[PDB]
Assembly symmetry: D2
Homo-oligomer: 385 residues x 4
């Protein structure tokens, strides 16, 4: 039905619908005032100290590739530029000690996680979202990222979060902790179990956290370590090839009706279950059996199944606790309204230009859709790397 | 739409459509003459020595619980008594040296696999499928199961097959290889990676072999080792809970349209991907937030999406290579027509009586269906056991 | 003080003091009649079913290389011929059910250990101790080794014993168990911990069992599997190289006074603690900076510290429970008089001819002797292989 | 005859511990350690070594003499020697971080200071009242900053992790800023590296050498002790390392030969009797196992002490340690070993930190295990443990 160009307009519309309340309010210093703090228990204490950074860091981590595109004068180009300026205005506010939207980095341990997503935003759009900020704003982000070191010894997983962050400071040529990078890189490698899956900690689990955290961030950390001879091209390649393998499962779990199963912890992160697939696509490294077009069509179906209606939004435009609908019963205890903005992490292909094959090739059936209609189903097999 | 009593009727109709060509031809001694030998390459050499025992063992492993029921006068009862007699007659012919449907145990290593599935049939229905056999037939199977030690080894993902087969021999009071049972038990425990998942051999894959082989056989073997103190109630509970946890994911991977992802090796085994769910349901051990009726309805959707139409059958009603359609391009090199009769393994809940709540309870949306329409969605989390 | 030629005359004399009471009695049919059964508890029930095969198989495995030499007219050459002939005679009585000295292979699991040692004798001197046996005697040994499989014994550190035994059956072209060879080969490798040390079981231990069993039997098993493509040359070099490393520690723990530490389990096996050193010496594969002569002089000092006097012998010339003297308190509960004939296992260098540099090169201090007196001391360091 | 008493044995250990350690301690007090201490290396090069070897001499020396100095003062001839040497130590410790002093020690250059700061920290942990508390507050703060400046050179070798962990636990104990993450990682990596029967691996690679005595056991236990009161390491963990050390000491006590030698094997045999720090530490804690008595440990290590220090074969013409094992044998020195490196030799004298009236020093002579076994005496059965 819809074309690649129409698909892009859909993604733009849905990505705007998710991310704009976060970005715009931060730009107006009203994010604390206007964003709900919805929790399963209903308690806001504790949550209120951490939830805004989660919203900013997760929102920008997903919109960043789109905003890294060169400006132009298309109807989309206007939107990209309007969004980017509001983002930069927001980031100055988030570290301005005088702004009512100043973001917490010191109370609680949770800031470790979401500074990593804010760093991923920067690593995905450095020329668009980091460099234009003024030097005092840059310094505050440098100091805020460094201040996280008094809590990083905490949760076993969360190791990679602070590795990503320290490798960000290494790549910005300021003080960084070699130890936290060596430990986290080496532990993520040890946590590989096979066939494109790590464990997020000592015990393996079948959940979406390989796409939520592990694959995208390990590659991004290793890329930072490479130029300084801290990681080798061989272990960058090994992590990259493992993300490419993990994406095959993610593409294959999209059903013919454009749904995907709800399993494991934090199903409230919705389409961030596909960040592995989305990152691989943005890097033009999709597996050989998978055409870009079928990734665009599958994720377009998932996107409109989950964000075109308002089942996942409240009366003022914010994401509500749930999976597809208002389902607070499925939210983990650490989840609040801010954490839900993991939703953006499937929209990374927007960082491909509008003239990329991914957005221009004719519609294509994705794997499961071919499988169930008697079409060409490729053989799949475990990999040993 | 349909009621539980209709769902039972559909399952019987569809299990009949899968297994009757195999059981009837073997009973009449024309299984070799009539059954196709389809392969991805088109060659029949090698395959023709092993494909028939594949069809017989794989089929019986799945239909055995249904045939363990006591006899009734009802229409369904007439079907059961009729099918059971043809299995008994076919089992006689299969080790009769004069019958043209003599099956191969002695050439190649592959009879190791399929002897284990045939053993499983005997294990799931001893009084209905084993005790009625004549003494000569009994000793012939005992001898041929013992002749399999000659090939053995690979130390890999066939090891659990021989462990099941030697545990059968132990349960029957005959000579058996204690070392093979011990190595299979300890190695399968050591291959547990977590959250209900084993690795099949020393290599983790994300595929259906946990359903195809691991959970159902490990539990069945331990149950054979329990009476004689070769396994403990502790390690049996361990495997039982591991299978139950695994079933949680399989139930959740049924999409609202009654489909499920195609991923990993041997996707050609179709609904065998749900044996772990089917075995748990038969044992009345579904995790208590997963109702028996919603398992019945979910697998009714999968069962007729794959078997009610003929996209998976040739002109004579045999299974063909593929997933949903004739798709020989998804088949593994080792796969042939008889391999496909794994398809029976999701029908084990027909071993539950017609008045069991599994077949009599109200219609119920399975987990994905509720999740995507905005109904209750039970939170999930990784387990440590 | 003493020359190489005299050193050899001492090894022959002391080896004769140890091995002849076992060998001569077995040849005369009087081993059961004459050999004591000494135990820490003083009990003999149970021990009396197994101690005799312990004595034979442990004794032969140490004298075998000496007996593999070709005959000559020298004072020492006449002794080899006399001993080999008594060994052949004893071996025929051993499986002769008319002989009073028919050894037990059927009661208890212990036969697994000592059959393996008996097998090691044959492997070290095939031409001299196996090939001259009559055909009925050869077949009885084949049946006796095969009849052990019913007793796994588990213990998991008896795996190498059955693996060596089975690989001996393969080496003779008769029916062997593949599975047992494969599992024992792969387990010992899994049990490598580093730096020339295996763990003899799940956990590492600092004891002499690496020299009692692991290295010599692992190298010997692999050498059997090499012709039949059953193990690669690379995994034979690996095991060989690990033994050569281990021998360095054993060479170095011989103190300047010709003692060595008493430590770990089963110190009652006495100079068998040097079996890896002795086997490396026999194979002319000592490392660069370990002279063959210094191994000769180091082991000569140990050999007469323990065997020249009578502290370790009883009034009848049999080994007694102890380290150096009658010290039954250090015996394991499973140990009896027969167990003690592991003491032959440091005498393998007599498998080198008298004209070999090991026996003709002039005296030389050993590593600890040189170091404590101030001479050259080569840098040691851990190895990675 | 040749068999000494317990009172004599303590005197011999004082004489010998004094022969090793007084050149280092007295020169640092005088401020002439850089001037006078040799810098001996197998190659002969001094570049790089001269930046690290002085802290090596200081930290290693102090970690071995520290228990002796923890004893309260008295007016015996030995109590005089402790008072004098202690006061020189506090003098040398002031010079060591005086920017004015010429014996100022390096903490900024190279990675090696991580190692030797840890040994110095271990002296402080073994005699807090005697070597740390009497320091002026300026000198104390200076040490704190030097220990904290070690984090910028980090993410170093597989091993060395225990060193930084002990250091960070020391800063934890003093109530000053510490890196909790470096503590969490070194506690857990060491727990993962246990292979069994009393042996860790020093990093991912297992090796049969004396580094379980050199570093592993004493610093693991000493680190967990700092972690216990602070709700950061359980009694279960601390007793676990403690029993593992007691098991390790059984092998080390057993490897002493009847003639009073021990085998040279594995890396850095140049550390000489540091191969007995595990035995020495367990003897000092009075947690020897049931079948090894304090007397046989004293007598065994008295034989070892004077087989290597009574004579001058390990000393140069000025009383400095030379490269080797028992003699001038520089060919067994690793490339990282200098003259400072060799003052690990003090770590076997920990039992001098038991008072002169302890059973360790008062009980009659007693053969040690190997000595008893080779002459036909009681030999206790050994067996691998599972803990
Ligand atoms: N609160 C702990 C929990 O923290 C959660 O971790 C997530 C992750 O990526 O691991 C992150 O997405 C989320 O924002 C954060 O709240 C997590 O550490 C688990 C597992 O140890 O335990 C919870 O106590
Ligand atoms: N024939 C080999 C093949 O064996 C296949 O293994 C499957 C399994 O359990 O993994 C089993 O379901 C199937 O019936 C059996 O044919 C397989 O082991 C592959 C590699 O895994 O190599 C083939 O030679
Ligand atoms: N009897 C068991 C005991 O067997 C002993 O094992 C030794 C070995 O090689 O492991 C062997 O040298 C000796 O002949 C044999 O008697 C031992 O396996 C221990 C530990 O598993 O348990 C005892 O019951
Ligand atoms: N410089 C490296 C070297 O450092 C040495 O480590 C020793 C240890 O504990 O392993 C320590 O005793 C010594 O003071 C220190 O200089 C060592 O890490 C080795 C590792 O093989 O490599 C050397 O480059």
């Amino acid at each position: 039905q819809t074309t690649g160009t129409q698909d892009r307009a859909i993604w733009v519309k849905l990505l705007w619908k998710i991310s704009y309340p976060v970005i715009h309010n931060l730009a107006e210093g009203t994010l604390h005032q206007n964003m709900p703090i919805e929790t399963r228990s209903g308690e806001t204490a504790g949550y209120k100290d951490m939830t805004h950074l989660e919203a900013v860091g997760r929102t920008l981590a997903g919109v960043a590739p789109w905003l890294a595109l060169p400006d132009d004068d298309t109807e989309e180009g206007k939107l990209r530029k309007q969004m980017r300026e509001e983002v930069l205005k927001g980031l100055k506010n988030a570290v301005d000690p005088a702004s009512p939207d100043l973001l917490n980095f010191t109370k609680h341990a949770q800031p470790i996680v979401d500074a990593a997503y804010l760093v991923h935003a920067f690593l995905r759009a450095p020329k668009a979202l980091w460099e234009p900020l003024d030097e005092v704003t840059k310094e505050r982000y440098i100091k805020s990222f460094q201040s996280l070191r008094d809590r990083t010894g905490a949760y076993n997983n969360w190791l990679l979060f602070t590795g990503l962050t320290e490798s960000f400071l290494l790549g910005k040529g300021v003080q960084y902790d070699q130890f936290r990078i060596r430990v986290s890189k080496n532990k993520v490698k040890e946590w590989y179990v096979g066939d494109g899956w790590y464990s997020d900690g000592p015990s393996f689990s079948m959940d979406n956290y390989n796409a939520y955290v592990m694959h995208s961030m390990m590659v991004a950390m290793l890329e930072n370590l490479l130029p300084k001879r801290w990681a080798s091209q061989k272990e960058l390649d090994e992590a990259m090839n493992r993300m490419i393998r993990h994406s095959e499962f993610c593409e294959r779990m999209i059903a013919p009706d454009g749904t995907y199963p709800a399993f494991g912890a934090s199903v409230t992160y919705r389409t961030a279950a596909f960040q592995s697939l989305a990152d691989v696509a943005l890097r033009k490294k999709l597996p050989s059996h998978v055409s870009p077009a079928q990734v665009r069509c599958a994720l377009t179906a998932v996107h409109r199944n989950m964000y075109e209606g308002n089942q996942n939004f409240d009366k003022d435009g914010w994401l509500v606790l749930g999976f597809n609908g208002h389902q607070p019963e499925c939210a983990d205890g650490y989840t609040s309204t801010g954490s839900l903005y993991m939703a953006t992490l499937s929209f990374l292909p927007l960082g491909l230009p509008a003239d990329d094959p991914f957005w221009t090739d004719a519609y294509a059936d994705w794997t499961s859709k071919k499988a169930w209609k008697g079409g060409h189903l490729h053989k799949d097999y475990k990999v040993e790397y």
